[PDB]
């Protein structure tokens, strides 16, 4: 399977530790945007919304948004070890729910508000660590963002925001319990030590 | 079910309009924001049977399939297919219209109407929310539903809200031609589609 990304890009680092999770292993295609390689009639023919993450599955199913590819992943790879699938993207209604509204809450709110500041401040700086404080708060006695007692990928998804979060420059330590899932969850996760050093190394 | 929304808000109609579908009645419970009446104080705020407490219009929207319209296996499939496949393309519409189609409606309209009020829209804000619908536009295509389907499925439901939201803004959807061809079918057919129309009307009070 065909994967289009950035190295240092939050949402495509969220996709690789997911697929990392399910044994799957992803074709990589680096499509530098600055290059305009995302414009190309090459790439707008599979994806019309020209963005990376954009996955293509064996069968040319063309897929994007980091979160709705980390979902596909699991349901349809991750599937094949039950309790795997379980662990990722619980089924039980409540519990899932929880995991869409932090995932949710990662496009719209956290890594929305970061991107508001730090690509162009201090109402964007409020806006952001007020996300912070949400994400703190969520976290409060429990050791995963949707809880369980596994990561789901609505951690692993927040674990690429958060390492974008920390070589950007932010002092994460003043939020005690987004620092402590943060050490904790990366020493975990299976391919987290990737995310970080793609986040640093190139993001 | 206790419901605390604003009629105005698109993701508390998008619910609405999801709950009409399953066959819930929400007990509505009018949350003034601007007075401070969940620790993001997110409306709408869905309290279930058994005090769970839900935010998030569109976790809210799969939840009330999942649980409430499950029995009727084939309305279930409608509202929100199985297939892999299917479901990824109504989740990248779902995420699509939070992460871009209302986000950018938002980042070109509220400095307008809300805090400052902006005296004129910025254009690069414009190009960018124009983007969307192309994209939008794009989507449909060939295609009577947002995520594909013979069917409405919440994606559409989801979108409605949000393009309620463009046309009492004074948007012309015209210049979309399938935006406003399946914005017209959809409000026609989809359940609580009054309720969508009712309360995009009352969002129409900041653009006076
Ligand atoms: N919602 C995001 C979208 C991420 C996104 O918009 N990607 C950026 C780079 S990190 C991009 O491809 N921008 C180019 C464009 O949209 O034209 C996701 O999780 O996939």
Redesign the interface.
């Known amino acids: 399977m065909d994967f289009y990304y950035l190295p240092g890009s939050a949402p495509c680092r969220a996709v690789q530790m997911t697929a990392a999770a399910v044994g799957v292993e992803l074709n990589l295609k680096l499509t530098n945007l600055m290059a305009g390689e995302h414009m190309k009639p090459e790439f707008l023919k599979l994806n ?2 020209h963005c990376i993450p954009t996955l293509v599955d064996e069968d040319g ?1 063309v ?3 980091s ?3 980390q ?2 992943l699991v ?2 790879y991750g599937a094949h070890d039950a309790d795997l699938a379980e662990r990722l993207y619980p089924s039980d ?2 519990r ?3 995991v ?2 932090r995932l ?2 990662d ?3 956290l890594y ?1 508000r970061f991107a508001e500041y730090y690509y162009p401040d201090p109402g964007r700086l409020r806006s952001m660590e007020q996300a912070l404080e ?1 994400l703190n ?2 976290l409060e006695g429990e050791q995963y963002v949707a809880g369980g007692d596994d990561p789901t990928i609505a951690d692993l998804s927040i674990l690429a925001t958060i390492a974008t979060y920390e070589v950007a420059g932010y002092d994460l330590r003043r939020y005690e319990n987004v620092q402590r899932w943060y050490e904790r969850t990366s020493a975990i996760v299976p391919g987290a030590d990737k995310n970080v050093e793609g986040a640093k190394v190139f993001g």
């Open positions: 019309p919304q199913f897929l994007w948004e979160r709705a590819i979902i596909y349901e349809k209604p409540r899932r729910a929880v869409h509204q949710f809450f496009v719209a709110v929305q949400f708060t969520f």
